[PDB]
């Protein structure tokens, strides 16, 4: 559907709800905009 042929899933990464930056599980605040991890 909205996926892409061959794409890889990485565990724990979270998408910032404010700026859409993809963060590491260990980041508690978005490295770009400083929004808290959902």
């Amino acid at each position: 559907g909205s996926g892409f042929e061959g794409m890889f899933i990485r565990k724990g990464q979270w998408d910032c709800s404010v700026c859409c930056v993809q963060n590491e599980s260990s980041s508690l605040k978005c490295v770009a905009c400083d929004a808290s991890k959902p």
Partner: protein
């Protein structure tokens, strides 16, 4: 799970960055405001032969008119467009500064250089003078945000570089705001030819 990339759009104030990103209608209607940084993130979906991809394009709120942008603007960018105005030579002269600021934070992510406003007859920065991209492993395109001329080219080149697939194609153009000025097809052909000619000439 979807494919998405942070794309930072940088360049001097007045070069047409906002006008450009706004051509993509759904990216405008679905844009998200980032208050800490004063940014609008436009989600620009393109449908490729392998599925949809999304460029989350970061547009400033004009702060570039007062100095460099904060680190948070650049952080985790996966690709970039540097824009200048082909009617203002100073905007081209500042391209190296924007490139420096970008690479300082992001290292050598894929970057497209775009000369905007080629619909304006009295062009000042012409193909023969545009050489910064050759110097730095960058792709260049003429664009006209107001006429949608070459709108998809930076995004297609970046998609191919990021995904590692030189045969990736867009199956259709996204829905764009209708042209507000007409890009003369003959002028476009001439500018494209001029760029080829210059590409073959030595620096």
């Amino acid at each position: 799970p979807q494919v998405q990339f942070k794309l930072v759009l940088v360049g001097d104030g007045g070069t047409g960055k906002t006008t450009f990103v706004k051509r993509h209608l759904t990216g405008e209607s679905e844009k998200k405001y980032v208050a800490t940084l004063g940014v609008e993130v436009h989600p620009l979906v393109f449908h490729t032969n392998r599925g949809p991809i999304k460029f989350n394009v970061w547009d400033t709120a004009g702060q570039e008119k007062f100095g460099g942008l904060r680190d948070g603007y650049y952080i985790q960018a996966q690709c970039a467009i540097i824009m200048f105005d082909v009617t203002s030579r100073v905007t081209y002269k500042n391209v190296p500064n924007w490139h420096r600021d970008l690479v300082r934070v992001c290292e050598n992510i894929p970057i497209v250089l775009c000369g905007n406003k080629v619909d304006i007859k009295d062009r000042k920065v012409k193909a023969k003078s545009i050489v910064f991209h050759r110097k730095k492993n960058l792709q260049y395109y003429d664009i006209s945000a107001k006429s949608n001329y070459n709108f998809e080219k930076p995004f297609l080149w970046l998609a191919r570089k990021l995904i590692g697939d030189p045969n990736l194609e867009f199956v259709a153009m996204p829905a764009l705001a209708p042209p507000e000025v007409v890009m003369d097809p003959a002028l476009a052909a001439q500018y494209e030819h001029d760029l080829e000619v210059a590409q073959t000439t030595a620096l």
